[PDB]
Design a protein around this ligand. Structure first.
Ligand SMILES: Nc1ncnc2c1ncn2[C@@H]1O[C@H](COP(=O)(O)OP(=O)(O)O)[C@@H](O)[C@H]1O
Ligand SMILES: Nc1ncnc2c1ncn2[C@@H]1O[C@H](COP(=O)(O)OP(=O)(O)O)[C@@H](O)[C@H]1O
Ligand SMILES: Nc1ncnc2c1ncn2[C@@H]1O[C@H](COP(=O)(O)OP(=O)(O)O)[C@@H](O)[C@H]1O
Ligand SMILES: Nc1ncnc2c1ncn2[C@@H]1O[C@H](COP(=O)(O)OP(=O)(O)O)[C@@H](O)[C@H]1O
Lengths: 459, 437, 267, 36, 264, 439
């Protein structure tokens, strides 16, 4: 039905598109201008040690702080760690202003994000009979029961997949499936092995024209096997187990068919449930079935968490099953949001700060901003001459780092509107006056905007 | 007919040249703001390209200068293809969902998913239900041109029984899903009954072929996919509002499947524009989330407006330029505006005259230009309607100097209301005491 | 020594034992001693803004022209707005129809749950059957946007050989059963019970409205189950036919010894 | 001789399902091979 | 009655002395000043709920049990035209069999639903409570006893005596119990009093009109020579934690003609 | 895994004299607080004395939570031990006082004993009668051990468990008659060669001997909060897991206290009093203390042990200061145990225990440098240096860690004593309470 467009399958440029990893050696020593980064040696070496701690499964509740000013690369190191670990290890990048809810207490969204940050891998098997039914032919028993009519000992089903068909002898108590689900000739079913009760998926596509109007879903023939003995790896986060044990998904009554029919409400979860789930996960690991994989809870903007949250974080980090907590703070001496009494470093309380491996982040040299400009320009595809690179580096040193990475898009638009293919000095000198920075904006705001009058701002 | 002349009615698009980006002064309603309109044209030309994800464009300047005018010009000059979202900042402070999620939903609305398909539907008026109690049946349906007899097997006879279809209904069958949707009854059977029921609505007969197939271009947003997948019958929640904190795992699954649809060529992602009007009302607890939501691949090119000078930030107690924190102003780009010369004021009042179909003598237009220079735009534009109405009371076609001076005498500009307040302080409730004469 | 909580309402006392000998009929005489006396002008004639009697001339017009003419859920007013950027664009892709949405946007939460009670799930079974790398994760186009209905770990979990994930998805029930919180005797109970307050209005319309709202036999039928005569005419027929309570939609009580009552038996 | 009860019995030899005579004319005999 | 004095001087030792000097059959409600700040209701509602916890009532009741063993259970449906829901059972013929004189009685639909949500088969002894309509199954009667059993049923003998018994009891009920009973109904066999015990229970704001109508109902009990009123004590420990919006409302709570004594 | 309190295996005192051993069971390096906690542990194990308050005060990183976990490992999985943090109480669903009341009533176990009836034996035949399109079910189960041959009946729930378990002919099942669960133990015959969808061949067990109806006396321990939730709601059970309990009125608790006293007198139940540990109690405001001081007045209050960190702090919700952030009408009730900062000859052996727990081998020069760092940056930096130096020694392929690995880890990861100086040096490129500049 849905028409497919034959266009170009490109991607979009974010602020951290060029980051592809840390770019280390085989010994851990960082190397400049590798995998997107420029410089920032000690922070990348320390983050490589953090990545090794995560993949070595010795982390059981550590905590890592990323200090440093704004626009120096904390979130860049976070996305570098998330792309270095891969995809099969979880990564939950919440912010500080994302624990404040209106259905639960704000010391509960933290624990639910801990449970989102932990993964559990389960390897199991799947044995199913599969496919479209061709015959439903019974077989009369050898010794019929006296007092009854038909006595049927083995029920035969001919299942036809898209590769090969197969006759199947079954126990006769599949009949209660077939009458209840209304399985007929031409309906794909699957028969499991642990119970053996077939469930119809739908009418096949070969019988989509025997009638004219009587229509339902017309699912195709299962293009696969007829006897699946297929093994499955299955990744479930512990948040999903907490939700599925707290609020059950599918029930058969009125009030659970109103619970899924009304809006799902976040509810606080009692600690006995989490203790039981930890006690049973640590039993299935000891049986050697499920693997626990801890992840990263990158709490960005860690100075928005107030003092009522770090107290709960101490308890949650002292748990025997917990991921790493990579915080991200860009403040100096700051007032903690909850208790307006103590001026502490980074917005972090001094009791909580001793847990943290504090990684610094330094400002950039005035000859590395131009390398970041070259990498960002060859990421977007916007090519430009060397004097233009030097002018963008001049604006980067004198004003901001995030501002010289944003004079590349209007310069490229004005370049391909003026009639060229590459960006020159004239296009950036024209685009620097259509898009002012914060500094000249504050200069216009103070100098020209003298006071509140007719043609003035509202202070 | 639910469309009346508001303040933003003469602005039919941005009004710049599409070739070389030259803002000619009097085009498509907007008048004489050449540098800000050129910068908005550059922003709009990097919106329609849709490659560069998650910028932020602040539009500063004094009040009554045209910051929402340029925003409505960018909204009109995109079409119905690329989305746009007019969200003032006070909409976020809700009592059912938090500020973070109600601001995430502002980002999830401004990204469309575009999918083209073929709808195999069948309109038709029922003539005679013929059920053969032997399972089989025959349905006779007609239109204004054709008439046909289609077979039925087992179960849609039961669907007809559950729908209670009589002779004279207007049924529609979606043959790709197979469910009867009774649209009502026809005007040819309004003569039949006398005391109708409640549910019956009358319709014209279907016209043309029975089997209608048509290629239709659906365009939904990501917020639609998020709210539909919230709960079971959750599609009515986005009309009603009965939704709350949607979990992050549902939005993660939905973004993964939208990336998968983009890989398989089913869907095309069209990024749009989020417009956060009066962004200075957001507290720091919202900018700390905007600074992270402008990082993903699925983030719209945010355009925001502001009025205030060096003011306090809500939620904290320290002054800052534009009412915004400086770690947020290091991230945005700022397009300043400027006040208007009288040569622009005269033709802006002329455009507001010809929009409201009010004729003005040139002396009245010069007087109204002087009033607009001495009081502002929002008071001068509010004197065209009043002068037209006072001319209508004394039965004159063209308004004059007398009607504009009458309108200036009756209603007060905000420049003289402050002198009226400070002239009589003992009766207005200042903070403590009233005299009451 | 049997017992029960205190009862606040007004029942009907039996006169004597030697009068109603063998064939007697119990009557549901439970009424509240708390009463609320309304006239027959407000409760019946024209005081209600919903009853469309004379005097209340608005309630017929307002009912029709807000529920069936100027409604954005009637199928005529959906069929004109389904073709592009418009508001019911998404309705083609959710597994519904026009009649499905029109029944879902007028019934209760209750009757919509009864309509959910007779819908066989199939998008969980798609993940069981259509699970090949060659099959590119096939979903029906008329059920495309129901993504969370499709990829669900519970549907795969209910099929596996070892129940290592079925012993995690409902471990709350196993812990609730293994602590003996169903065989434990109920220690506390409310000290007073009462029927709901009714209106003492002295028209026949008030008694009809009370026995159609406070009892409302459609919900009782949809809650307790089908009549055995209906089971006979549905199980001795020549063709399979459906039931409006397809099963008894009473929830299973989570306390085995004392279910849905407060009556106490000594032991 | 039950009116509407279909018996299943599983012993050491096999497992058989007995259907009453009064249900063979009904729709419950379509699976068992009787039908209407 | 205010109990001043510094901390560590025995203010609450006097309170336990009073609560052990009054006795068991006099109500005594000890609370704190921080307990009334709730999240469902306004705090004046919690104050009035404590004021009516601190007033007791001693009531005689005459329960009318039908204590029998079910002999023949046969439904008798009525006419049911096309109205969507279909058939509905409207009349029964349940036969109860006690030790001395059986009875064969006829039921409403609602008392049948009370039977039906208890799963009463043939042989189950019950006693139909004809005050609400409730009917608790006790067990299989011992005439059907078999040691080869698996359901773990409780076998009790046939109830001796007449099948239509009538027994009087004494009950100790506070006025707040009557407020909660008439506020959220959980007695009877209709839908409001059945779907109202499947929801989660919430403290609600019992208004002035219910608290006056229940006062008139209790006065009707007292004028029939049945109930006895016994007022009590509200001991508010740590009264300085109450804010001014509570000491404003204690004036009107103490101006009532029925109000317990407050010990702060 | 290896958390921050996994090396601790109890409190480590004597059983006859309770003298503090200088090095025993993880908690190594402190004598006064461990002896006082041993006295508190002994009067908790007595179970007689009700409603006390123990306040473990002292500087941070001195082992207060370590002493609490030492008492937690020493009671075993018999006595309840609620590890409540002081920030969990501030809910939005329920009130701030009722969360405290639940936190007290979660730490009073009720230990009841009940008789169940278990079966055992080989299933010979199943007989299930089913209706058509809704209805009841009938069941006859013939089961045989080596001695008895019984033909039992079944109800609806037993058939709903049999079909859920798929119990065929020739299975060794054991049915609890009271609770009604079915656990297949294995088979005695082999798998048939007549049907396809049968299953997996289970364990080969023989026919069990003895009797069918055996009796068992099981012991179930529930907290008082679970009794409150199962007796506060008519149908809404399982809300003691999903936290959906709104409010429990006082009429329910004042009946459950009397019924638990009656169960104590009847010999049915036994009340096991427990420990309520409140970690960092200084976060509670005065509206919490004005209830905690009066909940410790009855026979059903747990012995509260709680920690603190602060000096003269101001109490939240007030305008004035106090020692430890606690009011002086509440500090009369409590009993304060002080903890002292450590000495380097104790930090050496604490880091040795933390190194031997995380499976890290050291050289004495590296341990001396590590002790020198731990004198100046606490244990919380030194243990992180242990794990980091282990992985850096794993990167350069060295057997044991050295001085160079510890110097590498000290160079990469700052202690807080250098991050404070890093804040105080560059104050112009950090957001203080004011603006910031960019180069
Ligand atoms: N080492 C680096 N190499 C290249 N680009 C960088 C580097 N560090 C930071 N950037 C760029 O600087 C911009 C802003 O940095 P950001 O991560 O926002 O700082 P913060 O982490 O303080 O928020 C990002 O767009 C990123 O692309
Ligand atoms: N360049 C222009 N040409 C024509 N009309 C304009 C122009 N700029 C502003 N206006 C009109 O002036 C009014 C005020 O602009 P607006 O953006 O609402 O001011 P503010 O930024 O203070 O909200 C608008 O109604 C708009 O119609
Ligand atoms: N007159 C008394 N006789 C015996 N014990 C007393 C007396 N007065 C006070 N106490 C003791 O003082 C302790 C605390 O008294 P309490 O009433 O709690 O003080 P407060 O008045 O501050 O509440 C109690 O344990 C009680 O045993
Ligand atoms: N006496 C001790 N014995 C064993 N380990 C200790 C001791 N003191 C401190 N520790 C270790 O130091 C860490 C900090 O102790 P903790 O009790 O968390 O400090 P705080 O009381 O400041 O929270 C713990 O992980 C613990 O393993």
């Amino acid at each position: 039905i849905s028409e497919v467009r034959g266009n170009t399958r490109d991607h979009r440029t974010a602020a951290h598109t060029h980051i592809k990893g840390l770019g280390l050696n085989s010994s851990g020593i960082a190397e400049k201008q590798a995998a997107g980064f420029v410089g920032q040696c000690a922070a990348r070496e320390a983050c490589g040690v953090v990545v090794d701690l995560i993949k070595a499964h010795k982390m059981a509740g550590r905590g890592v702080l990323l200090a440093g000013g704004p626009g120096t690369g904390k979130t860049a190191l976070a996305l570098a760690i998330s792309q270095e670990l891969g995809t099969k290890i979880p990564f939950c990048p919440i912010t500080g202003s994302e624990i404040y809810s209106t259905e639960v207490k704000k010391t509960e969204v933290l624990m639910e994000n801990f449970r989102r940050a932990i993964g559990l891998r389960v390897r199991e098997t799947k044995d199913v009979y599969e496919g479209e039914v061709t015959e439903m032919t019974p077989e009369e028993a050898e010794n019929p029961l006296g007092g009854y009519g038909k006595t049927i000992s083995t029920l035969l089903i001919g299942l036809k997949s898209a590769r090969g068909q197969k006759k199947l002898r079954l126990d006769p108590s599949i009949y209660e499936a077939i009458q209840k689900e209304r399985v007929q000739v031409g309906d794909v079913i699957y028969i499991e092995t642990n119970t053996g009760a077939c469930k119809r998926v739908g009418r096949s596509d070969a019988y989509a024209t025997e009638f004219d109007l009587e229509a339902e879903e017309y699912v195709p023939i299962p293009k696969g096997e007829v006897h699946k003995k297929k093994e499955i790896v299955q990744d479930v986060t512990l948040h999903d187990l907490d939700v599925a044990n707290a609020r059950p998904q599918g029930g058969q009554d009125i009030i659970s068919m109103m619970g899924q029919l009304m809006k799902p409400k976040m509810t606080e979860i009692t600690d006995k449930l989490r203790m039981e789930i930890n006690k049973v996960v640590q039993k299935y690991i000891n049986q050697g079935v499920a693997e626990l994989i801890p992840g990263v809870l990158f709490i960005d903007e860690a100075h928005m968490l107030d003092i009522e949250c770090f107290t709960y974080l101490n308890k949650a980090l002292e748990s025997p099953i917990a991921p790493i907590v990579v915080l991200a703070s860009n403040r100096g001496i700051a007032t903690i949001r909850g208790a307006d009494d103590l001026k502490a470093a980074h917005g972090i309380p001094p009791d909580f700060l001793q847990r943290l491996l504090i990684i610094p982040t330094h400002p950039y040299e005035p000859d590395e901003i131009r390398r970041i400009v070259r990498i960002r320009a060859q990421t977007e595809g916007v090519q430009l001459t060397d004097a233009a690179v030097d002018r963008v580096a001049e604006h980067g040193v004198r004003i901001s780092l995030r501002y010289c990475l944003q004079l590349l898009a209007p310069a490229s638009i004005l370049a391909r509107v003026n009639g060229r293919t590459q960006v020159d000095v004239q296009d950036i000198a024209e685009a620097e006056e259509l898009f002012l920075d914060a500094r000249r904006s504050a200069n216009i705001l103070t100098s020209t905007g003298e006071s509140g009058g007719l043609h003035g701002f509202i202070s | 007919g639910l469309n009346l002349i508001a303040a933003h009615s003469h602005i039919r698009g941005l009004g710049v040249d599409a070739d070389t980006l030259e803002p000619r002064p009097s085009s498509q309603g907007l008048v004489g703001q050449e540098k800000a309109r050129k910068a908005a044209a550059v922003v709009l030309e990097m919106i329609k390209q849709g490659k560069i994800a998650g910028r932020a464009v602040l539009i500063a300047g004094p009040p009554s200068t045209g910051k929402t005018a340029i925003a409505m010009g960018m909204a009109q000059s995109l079409g119905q293809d690329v989305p746009f979202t007019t969200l003032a900042a006070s909409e976020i402070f809700s009592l059912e969902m938090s500020k973070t999620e109600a601001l995430t939903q502002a980002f999830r609305k401004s990204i469309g998913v575009r999918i083209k398909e073929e709808s195999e539907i069948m309109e038709g008026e029922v003539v005679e239900i013929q059920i053969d109690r032997s399972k089989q049946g025959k349905l006779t349906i007609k239109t204004t041109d054709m008439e046909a007899i289609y077979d039925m097997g087992s179960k849609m006879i039961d669907a007809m029984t559950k729908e209670r279809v009589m002779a004279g209904d207007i049924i529609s069958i979606d043959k790709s899903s197979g469910k009867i949707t009774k649209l009502g009854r026809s005007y040819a059977r309004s003569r039949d009954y006398d005391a109708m029921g409640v549910d019956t609505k009358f319709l014209q007969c279907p016209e043309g072929e029975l089997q209608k197939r048509k290629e239709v271009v659906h365009t939904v947003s990501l917020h639609e996919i998020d709210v539909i997948n919230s709960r079971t019958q959750g599609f009515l929640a986005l009309f009603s509002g009965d939704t709350g904190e949607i979990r992050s795992e549902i939005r993660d699954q939905i973004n993964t499947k939208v990336a998968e649809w983009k890989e398989e060529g089913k869907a095309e992602i069209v990024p749009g524009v989020l417009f956060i009007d009066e962004v200075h009302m957001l507290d720091i607890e919202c900018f700390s989330y905007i600074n992270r939501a402008l990082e993903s691949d699925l983030a719209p090119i945010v355009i925001m407006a502001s009025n205030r000078g060096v003011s306090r930030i809500r939620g904290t107690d320290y002054k800052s330029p534009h009412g915004l924190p400086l770690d947020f102003l290091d991230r945005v780009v700022i397009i300043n505006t400027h006040p208007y010369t009288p040569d622009e004021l005269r033709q802006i009042l002329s455009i507001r005259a010809q929009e409201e179909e009010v004729d003005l003598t040139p002396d009245a237009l010069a007087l109204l230009t002087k009033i607009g220079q001495e009081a502002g735009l929002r008071y001068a534009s509010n004197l065209i309607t009043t002068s037209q109405l006072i001319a209508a009371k004394r039965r004159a076609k063209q308004v004059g100097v007398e009607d504009v001076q009458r309108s200036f005498k009756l209603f007060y500009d905000p420049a003289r209301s402050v002198r009226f307040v400070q002239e009589s302080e003992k009766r207005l409730i200042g903070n403590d005491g009233v005299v009451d004469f | 020594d049997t017992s029960s909580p205190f009862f606040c309402g007004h029942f009907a006392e039996t006169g004597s034992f030697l009068r109603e000998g063998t064939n007697v009929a119990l009557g549901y005489s439970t009424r509240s001693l708390v009463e609320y006396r309304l006239p027959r002008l407000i409760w019946c004639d024209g005081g209600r803004l919903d009853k469309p009697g004379p005097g209340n001339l608005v309630a017929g017009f307002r009912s029709k022209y807000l529920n069936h003419m100027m409604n954005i859920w009637t199928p005529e007013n959906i069929r004109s707005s389904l073709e592009g950027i418009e508001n019911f664009t998404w309705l083609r892709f959710v597994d519904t129809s026009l009649q499905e949405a029109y029944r879902a946007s007028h019934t209760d939460v209750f009757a919509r749950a009864v309509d959910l009670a007779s819908k066989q799930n199939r998008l969980g079974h798609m993940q069981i059957v259509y699970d090949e790398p060659e099959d590119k994760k096939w979903t029906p186009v008329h059920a495309l946007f129901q993504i969370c209905e499709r990829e669900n770990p519970k549907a795969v979990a209910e099929i596996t050989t070892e129940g290592v994930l079925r012993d995690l998805m409902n471990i709350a029930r196993v812990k609730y059963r293994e602590l003996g919180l169903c065989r434990l005797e109920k220690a506390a109970r409310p000290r007073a019970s009462a029927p709901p307050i009714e209106v003492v209005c002295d028209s026949r319309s008030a008694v009809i409205e009370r026995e159609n709202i406070m009892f409302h036999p459609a919900m009782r039928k949809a809650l307790f189950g089908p009549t055995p005569s209906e089971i006979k005419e549905a199980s001795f027929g020549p063709r399979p036919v459906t039931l409006y309570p397809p099963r008894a939609l009473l929830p299973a009580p989570d306390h085995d010894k004392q279910r849905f009552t407060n009556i106490t038996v000594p032991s | 001789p039950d009116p509407m009860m279909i018996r299943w019995v599983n012993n050491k030899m096999g497992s058989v399902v007995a259907v009453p005579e009064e249900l063979l004319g009904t729709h419950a005999g379509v699976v068992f091979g009787a039908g209407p």
